[PDB]
Amino acid sequence: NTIQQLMMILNSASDQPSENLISYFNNCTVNPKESILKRVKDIGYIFKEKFAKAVGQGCVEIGSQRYKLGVRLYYRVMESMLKSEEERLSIQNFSKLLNDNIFHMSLLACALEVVMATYSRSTGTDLSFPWILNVLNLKAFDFYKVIESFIKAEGNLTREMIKHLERCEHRIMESLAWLSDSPLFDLIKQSKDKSTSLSLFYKKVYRLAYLRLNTLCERLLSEHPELEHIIWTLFQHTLQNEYELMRDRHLDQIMMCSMYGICKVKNIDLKFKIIVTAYKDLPHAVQETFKRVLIKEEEYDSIIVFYNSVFMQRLKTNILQYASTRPPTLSPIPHI
């Protein structure tokens, strides 16, 4: 499928919910129809004004039209998702979901992302992710929740559109979901003091983390095959139990520090310069990820300063356990 095919579909589509959608709304314990219609209208105000600020004051009506295409995609996918959910569970139990402002904002943001990214490929100014999050005052972690389901729900997405949304998901998983403003930390706290969404998120993070670790270990540690499982064990425990280390930081920073730490206690010579040089070969790796790492307050410095001052501060005794007579029980490898 092609850009033109999807865009034809959207240009032909209705601005209002279908009768099927309205049926779903009317079957809810709390009727969400008016909230949903008003939310679409209100966000229209905000979107078109922020679009004109970004692109030029003469572009308000272009922004309006692009918003309308986004809304049409949002209604299509919403109906598809609801149909799927009803089929899978054999019941409609949609009131809590459909009255959730955050579900609607995430779904609309994802629809708008597909539209913004498609226009931003062609032309001036790049309105691709994460621009839409700031426009909508939406957190990355919330946007994340709809991506896989959105992809499944819109069979007319191009391979390029799907790849883009997958790239967005990865950026959320690796850093955006771990910013200090992320609902993720309240969800962790709720569980640590329980959440199916927390479990699903962590499962996805583990798979991404492990795959990236594996690539680095296959390049750097070919001679020492036993190391990968041990590094994975430090890495996984750190993500699970020392999650505050991820706050305002990046998955790959924890990855490289875990690699360095284990090799260090295993008496294996692997300086950061070597890890870092191999790291910048990873598919989407940027140098800033090891050159600019949060230390304490507003203070940023290299990954080495982070390792020496924060990472080891917190984990020195945990790392030493791996070389002791009783090493910690090794973490299972995430499958797939």
Binding site: Y260, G261, K264, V265, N267, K271, F272, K273, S302, I304, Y307, N308, M312, K316, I319, L320
Partner: peptide
């Protein structure tokens, strides 16, 4: 190891 610290960079 004598130290876990990275003495480089």
């Amino acid at each position: 190891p004598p130290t876990l610290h990275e003495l480089y960079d």
